[PDB]
Amino acid sequence: FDEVFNATRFASVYAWNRKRISNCVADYSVLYNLAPFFTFKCYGVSPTK
Amino acid sequence: NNKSWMESEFRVYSSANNCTFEYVSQPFLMDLEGKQGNFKNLREFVFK
């Protein structure tokens, strides 16, 4: 899931690119522990869950 | 297959607008005719 955000040049502000995610075991705890990825305020889902 | 370059078989459609899902895997047809003749296929499918 690295290639959709962590990459060369991001999308245009006006024209945002869409990436489909399917068939994976994505784990978001790594982003939880990553000092870059501190903004994690989930509105209706437990953030560590 | 068409000679030299990539074939023009994709003439069933010419334009694609918007896309949601993609799935690439091994071909659905595992039957082969390379063994010999005198035998035909009995492919059966149900699409539900």
Side-chain angles (χ1 to χ4, degrees), chain A residues 3-49:
Chain A
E3 45 267 29
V4 50
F5 327 116
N6 285 260
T8 81
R9 294 293 84 198
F10 220 71
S12 301
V13 309
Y14 63 91
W16 322 271
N17 53 6
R18 321 168 36 118
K19 205 28 173 186
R20 271 314 318 150
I21 282 161
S22 53
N23 174 267
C24 315
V25 296
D27 176 29
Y28 303 138
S29 306
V30 290
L31 307 94
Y32 294 159
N33 67 47
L34 300 138
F37 310 69
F38 72 102
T39 315
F40 35 75
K41 42 115 184 169
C42 292
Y43 276 76
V45 298
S46 168
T48 180
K49 235 187 180 294

Side-chain angles (χ1 to χ4, degrees), chain B residues 28-46:
Chain B
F28 51 106
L29 294 175
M30 312 340 298
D31 317 312
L32 272 297
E33 211 193 6
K35 302 177 288 297
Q36 73 257 8
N38 197 37
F39 283 134
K40 302 194 298 300
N41 302 116
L42 294 174
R43 277 169 194 105
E44 293 179 353
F45 308 99
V46 160

Side-chain angles (χ1 to χ4, degrees), chain B residues 10-48:
Chain B
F10 293 101
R11 58 197 177 267
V12 289
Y13 65 92
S14 298
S15 65
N17 294 314
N18 198 16
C19 281
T20 297
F21 177 74
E22 188 81 342
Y23 182 76
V24 293
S25 193
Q26 76 284 341
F28 51 106
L29 294 175
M30 312 340 298
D31 317 312
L32 272 297
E33 211 193 6
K35 302 177 288 297
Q36 73 257 8
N38 197 37
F39 283 134
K40 302 194 298 300
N41 302 116
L42 294 174
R43 277 169 194 105
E44 293 179 353
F45 308 99
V46 160
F47 301 153
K48 192 190 101 202

